[PDB]
Ligand SMILES: OC[C@H]1O[C@H](O[C@H]2[C@H](O)[C@@H](O)[C@@H](O)O[C@@H]2CO)[C@H](O)[C@@H](O)[C@@H]1O
Ligand SMILES: OC[C@H]1O[C@H](O[C@H]2[C@H](O)[C@@H](O)[C@@H](O)O[C@@H]2CO)[C@H](O)[C@@H](O)[C@@H]1O
């Protein structure tokens with residue numbers, strides 16, 4: 056007789072907790088809002104265990120994956136309620152014909168700039184270097200944004216034609232991935248050049264960028280609505296405008312739709328539906344959550360019509376319309392990880408843009424996931440994906456030999472030993488140790504695998520500290 | 523990775539003294555400033571291997587050593603490297619319990635063995651033989667009481683009687699336990715289990731008795747005796763019952779052989795906090811002080827720490843625990859134990875339900891114990907059951923028989939989803955057979971599956987999966 060909700064920390068969870076307080080008051084059912092770290096990865100683990108929240112708040116891109124594991128309850132809202140929200144929202148949360156969650160809002164990255172430092176922000180990425188040299192002479196910096204998450208660097212990568220998945224035959228095609236093409240190479244290459252010229256640092260993350268911009272150290276940042284609140288608390292007067300173009304083309308951010316899924320194991324499903332439908336989604340509730348932190352353009356029409364008046368929301372919908380809606384298919388979980396690697400390594404010099412993006416193309420389509428330990432004593436772990444509906448025989452290439460893995464069904468696991476021979480029971484051990492360019496601290500252990508269908512190859516790699 | 527650094531998360535069973543351990547965590551947090559959170563999930567022994575393979579889970583897990591081998595076979599446990607002086611602080615056989623393939627995979631907090639707890643007022647002399655239970659019950663039944671009530675659901679409680687006559691889990695040969703040799707189907711186990719089923723047939727015990735029913739019956743004075751471990755004593759201390767703790771009754775002139783567990787703490791391989799866990803275990807938890815706090819919350823039985831053990835043996839209850847323990851055997855840590863226990867469990871259940879004869883139940887159990895397979899039953903129908911097959915070194919093929927059909931399966935480890943109800947998620951889909959009725963039990967409903975295994979040498983062997991579910 057209680058509702059536990061999971062939502063990210065950057066989103067306002069305080070307002071949502073106030074909504075939960077309203078609900079508790081009326082019906083007497085307590086509502087607790089929590090914000091675990093890396094909740095999108097932690098949710099499947101515990102949901103398969105039978106634990107976890109009744110409701111989970113995340114962008115729709117992950118939800119398909121959850122729905123593939125039977126972790127999400129099916130949504131059956133009334134036709135009136137469906138009419139209360141825009142249709143494209145619902146369409147984003149539709150997976151295999153069924154509604155797996157409730158759309159709460161639309162998110163797209165935008166360019167937030169300091170008007171006092173930069174009254175006229177640039178309309179192109181190519182001007183960022185020239186600006187930087189100027190601002191660095193005054194003790195400031197042109198642009199700082201999170202390079203650790205690919206969500207923030209994707210607009211530049213996709214502007215020139217880089218794309219996550221190609222849509223063909225009524226579905227997103229997994230065998231066609233656009234991370235390795237000329238457009239992505241041009242965008243990420245431009246980023247790496249910006250890092251090599253010291254216009255940006257490869258270690259900058261979300262909190263570093265927020266601290267730099269909100270305190271007036273940098274003139275510009277790239278962020279979404281959730282950040283604006285903090286900037287309103289600072290002394291920085293900020294505009295929100297279109298992202299800079301790249302090679303004369305508009306930056307294409309991946310557009311998320313904040314959605315609330317219902318845990319399939321929850322006994323409270325009726326109460327979660329009551330709370331979300333008749334409490335959370337209203338002018339009042341969305342207004343509260345918006346007060347704590349902005350949601351961007353909400354899916355609820357009545358309140359949206361009032362939010363569009365906000366020029367920041369209008370800009371959010373401009374960048375959103377220039378971008379694309381993220382697919383919700385499970386493979387996204389792989390994509391975001393793969394790209395997350397390519398940007399980081401390429402930014403750290405660990406890999407060339409070409410190698411990083413090729414490995415990212417092979418990884419973005421994932422029949423396998425690797426868990427790299429931080430200690431050489433414990434082996435790495437290899438967990439295959441489900442592959443509901445191909446997957447004939449996959450041959451792994453290991454130091455001690457090759458390990459075949461054939462078909463079967465469901466989930467398949469294999470332990471990849473770090474470099475020790477233990478005696479020889481058909482086991483796989485890593486390659487290496489191998490050198491890591493520009494870094495003497497970390498060494499690299501790799502493995503390759505060749506997948507047969509009814510002729511592709513992936514490369515798994517684990518970086519580890521030396522001492 | 524997924525585990526929070528700068529903090530220690532600990533998992534321990536609900537019956538254990540987790541509160542005291544959390545007070546130890548208050549001491550450790552005060553001294554080092556590192557918070558320690560103690561949790562007691564349900565089915566933690568089964569839940570740990572699922573989340574720990576993904577890099578999540580606790581930094582430290584508290585369980586009997588029998589499971590740890592499995593965890594170590596999957597690479598889910600870090601190696602333990604205490605100082606030789608520290609190794610000498612504990613009894614050698616404890617270290618041998620947590621030793622797997624030459625490495626120490628955990629710290630053996632305590633020693634656990636089942637004992638016979640009786641009411642002094644109701645029974646002046648505790649029965650020295652199982653064969654005396656049938657008569658006494660009939661007498662106590664006339665007073666509105668019962669002779670013996672103990673949990674029949676978990677095979678840990680029924681194993682002492684089954685093994686007394688020569689029933690054994692695994693044969694030890696050439697310095698190693700023999701996987702192909704199972705002593706569940708021998709004459710001794712048949713005699714013990716037949717005697718239990720005879721106690722049920724004669725209404726001397728109810729097949730539905732579980733930990734809660736037995737604890738409630740004895741602690742409130744409804745039954746004269748119960749079979750339980752040290753952790754239960756606390757509850758009885760809360761009751762008004764004056765209770766003795768003594769040796770288990772003999773069966774066919776032979777002592778009951780309870781499986782002796784060693785309460786141990788393993789360190790999750792994925793934990794970044796390993797150093798903090800080591801410091802905590804060596805310099806805080808294993809001490810007279812810490813084990814005294816945990817002891818006050820719940821009794822640990824005979825601890826592996828000599829300094830505190832020497833003080834515990836003075837307790838006649840601990841002396842009885844070590845009597846039944848030395849009369850029993852230390853549980854093997856090999857992974858196949860996971861298959862052994864389930865087997866016995868299922869068998870006993872069948873035998874008590876009347877679904878099968880003792881002979882059939884124990885033969886089927888013998889087939890179940892040798893395949894090194896596991897099953898995770900879910901408390902909800904939305905999330906399926908998980909049927910895991912581990913490759914130790916062998917099975918040529920395994921074919922499942924499911925409602926929707928049969929699913930054939932041919933390195934590494936393989937987890938398969940056994941579905942209770944078809945869902946939106948499936949070429950190799952396997953759905954449980956059921957639901958099926960449970961005699962005597964309106965609440966719980968069971969789902970079954972049968973799988974056939976071809977080793978490629980000798981006969982094929984079939985196993986049976988059973989998962990139980992509540993109803994409304
Ligand atoms: O970094 C890739 C990441 O992108 C999206 O995550 C966003 C999320 O949509 C925002 O609401 C906010 O939390 O920022 C996140 C990135 O820092 C996807 O939702 C996620 O699946 C993906 O991994
Ligand atoms: O009966 C199956 C079960 O037996 C043992 O579990 C014991 C445990 O060792 C004790 O510490 C205490 O928690 O009681 C448990 C039974 O209720 C085995 O350790 C375990 O592996 C096995 O599944």
Ligand SMILES: *[C@@H]1O[C@H](CO)[C@@H](O)[C@H](O)[C@H]1NC(C)=O
Pocket residue numbers: 452453457486503
């Ligand atoms: C396995 O990889 C190594 C390099 O890591 C390569 O030299 C070798 O030819 C590969 N083996 C096969 C069978 O492809």
Ligand SMILES: *[C@@H]1O[C@H](CO)[C@@H](O)[C@H](O)[C@H]1NC(C)=O
Pocket residue numbers: 403493494495496497519520
């Ligand atoms: C080397 O890699 C490590 C990751 O373990 C990182 O912390 C460090 O900053 C890197 N150093 C350089 C010079 O890139």
Ligand SMILES: *[C@@H]1O[C@H](CO)[C@@H](O)[C@H](O)[C@H]1NC(C)=O
Pocket residue numbers: 675730731732963964965966990
């Ligand atoms: C039903 O069977 C289960 C076996 O797991 C047992 O624990 C329980 O006590 C029985 N009776 C009820 C009412 O659940």
Ligand SMILES: *[C@@H]1O[C@H](CO)[C@@H](O)[C@H](O)[C@H]1NC(C)=O
Pocket residue numbers: 923924955972
């Ligand atoms: C599969 O199980 C059913 C019982 O549900 C049984 O009737 C049938 O004979 C089994 N099939 C095989 C091939 O064993």
